[PDB]
Amino acid sequence: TENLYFQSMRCARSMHEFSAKDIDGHMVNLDKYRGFVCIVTNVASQGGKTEVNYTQLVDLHARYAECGLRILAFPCNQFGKQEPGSNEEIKEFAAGYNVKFDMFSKICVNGDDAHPLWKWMKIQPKGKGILGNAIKWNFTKFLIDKNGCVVKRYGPMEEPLVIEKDLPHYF
How many residues does the structure list for the chain? 171
SS (H, E, C) 66-135: HHCEEEEEEECCCCCCCCCCCHHHHHHHHHHCCCCCEEECCCECCCCCECHHHHHHCCCHHHCCCCCCCC
What is the distance between the alpha carbons of residues 77 and 83, in angstroms, rounded to a whole number? 4
Which of the stretches 41-49, 56-64, 87-95, 124-132 binds Cl ion when contact is defined by CB under 5 A? Answer: 41-49
Least distance between Cl ion and beta carbon 80 (Å): 8
Which of the stretches 15-23, 47-55, 110-118, 163-171 binds Cl ion when contact is defined by CB under 5 A? Answer: 47-55
- Comparing CB distances to Cl ion, the nearer of 19 and 46 is 46
The two beta strands, 69-75 and 37-43, are parallel
Q: Does 47 bind Cl ion (CB under 5 A)?
A: yes
Q: Does 49 bind Cl ion (CB under 5 A)?
A: yes
Residue 62: which H helix or E strand, with range?
helix 50-64
Q: Does 124 bind Cl ion (CB under 5 A)?
A: no
Q: Does 136 bind Cl ion (CB under 5 A)?
A: no
Which residue from 138, 145, 163, 170 is in contact with Cl ion, where contact means CB under 5 A? 138
Least distance between Cl ion and beta carbon 129 (Å): 17
Q: Does 45 bind Cl ion (CB under 5 A)?
A: no
What is the distance between the alpha carbons of residues 108 and 161, in angstroms, rounded to a whole number? 25
Indicate the residue whose CB is closest to Cl ion: 47
Least distance between Cl ion and beta carbon 86 (Å): 20
